[PDB]
Amino acid sequence: AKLTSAVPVLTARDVAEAVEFWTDRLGFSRVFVEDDFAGVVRDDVTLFISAVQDQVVPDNTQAWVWVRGLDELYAEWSEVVSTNFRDASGPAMTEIVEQPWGREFALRDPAGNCVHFVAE
Amino acid sequence: AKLTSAVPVLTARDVAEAVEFWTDRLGFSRVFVEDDFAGVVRDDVTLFISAVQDQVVPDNTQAWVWVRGLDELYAEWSEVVSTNFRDASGPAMTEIVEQPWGREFALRDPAGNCVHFVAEE
C-alpha cells in the first residue's frame, strides 16, 4: 500500500462562516458544503472543516501547508487579512519568519484555527 | 504561488505515547520528536502531533488520508489494532465501508483522534 496525500480537518463552531472566509477571502473553491462538514481546495491542497460546539477545539486546531512562492501568497493574503496577529479581532496573519524548520507565516481563521504556510 | 501539500496535526495529552503508537503499531517513521510536538511519516504522508491539555480536543480532531491499496493497509493494521470500534477504551478501527464519497475505514488512535483512510478512485 501507499499513503499518497492527506487532508487536515479544521474545526469551527460556524462552518458556513469558515467556508465563506476560505473561499471568498483566501481563494479556495468549494469541494462540497454541508451544515456540519465542508471541504475547500486550492491548487493541490484540500482542507476539510468540521463543526464543533466547544471553542477550545478550534483554539487548539492547527495545520501545515507547503507552498511554492510563499512571498507571492503572503502578498495576496496580506491585502485581505489583518497583519496584526496579536491585536486583530478578525482573522489575521503573521509575517513570514525564518524558523529552524523552515520559512513560514501563520494565519488564524475566523474560527480560531492556526494554519501555517511553509516555503517548499 | 502553488499550494503543494498539507500536513494534518493530530492532538494528544501524551505526545510520546502517540508517537509510539503511530510508529511501533502503525509503521510510520519518526521525522522529529519534541516534548510537545512531533512528526511521523509513511510514504508521502506526514502527520504532526501536538500536545493539548484537554481530552475534548483529540476527541474532536480528525484527519483524512488517501491510500492506494486500502485492503492491504487494513490487513496490515488488523494484525495489531482492534476491529471493535465501539469500545472506546483503546485504539481501534472500523471496517472498510463504501461511503457516498469513497471507500474508507476510520482508525481512532490512543489519544482519540479519528483518522480516515480513503481509497483513491
Rg (CA), chain B: 14
Domain CATH number, residue A94: 3.10.180.10
Retrieve residue B32's grid coordinates: 522529529
Question: Exposed, middle or buried by CB within 10 Å (0-12, 13-18, 19+), for B15?
Answer: buried
Contact criterion met (CB < 8 Å) for B72 and A1: yes
Contact criterion met (CB < 8 Å) for A45 and B4: yes
**Is residue A26 within 8 Å of residue B83, measured between CB atoms?**
no
CA nearest to B68, candidates A103, A119, A5 = A5
Rounded CA separation A49/B38 (Å): 23
Which experimental approach was used here?
Answer: X-ray
Query: What torsion, rounded to 10 degrees, do the Cα atoms A35, A39, A42, A44 define?
Result: 180
Contact criterion met (CB < 8 Å) for B54 and A50: no
Breaks (C-N over 2.5 A) in chain A follow: none
Rounded CA separation A45/B57 (Å): 24
CA nearest to B26, candidates A3, A4, A62, A47 = A3
Distance of CA A112 to the CA centre of its chain: 10
Rounded CA separation A6/B7 (Å): 7
Rounded CA separation A31/A20 (Å): 13
DSSP H or E stretch at residue B69: none
Nearest to A42 among B3, B69, B73 (CB): B3
DSSP H or E stretch at residue A77: helix A70-77
Residue with cell 462540497: A32
CB < 8 Å to B54, chain A? 56, 60
Work out the number of other CB atoms within 10 angstroms of the CB of residue B19.
Answer: 19
What does chain A come to in residues?
Answer: 120
For residue B117, the enclosing domain spans 1-121
Q: B16: which residues sit within 8 A by CB, 6+ positions away?
A: B33
Total domains present in chain A: 1
Retrieve residue A17's grid coordinates: 462562516
Rounded CA separation A112/B77 (Å): 34
CA nearest to B82, candidates B59, B99, B64, B107 = B107
Rounded CA separation B106/A9 (Å): 14
Q: Per DSSP, what are the bridge partners of residue B119? A: B67
Resolution of the entry in angstroms = 1.5
SS3 assignment, position B37: strand
CB < 8 Å to B63, chain A? 6-9
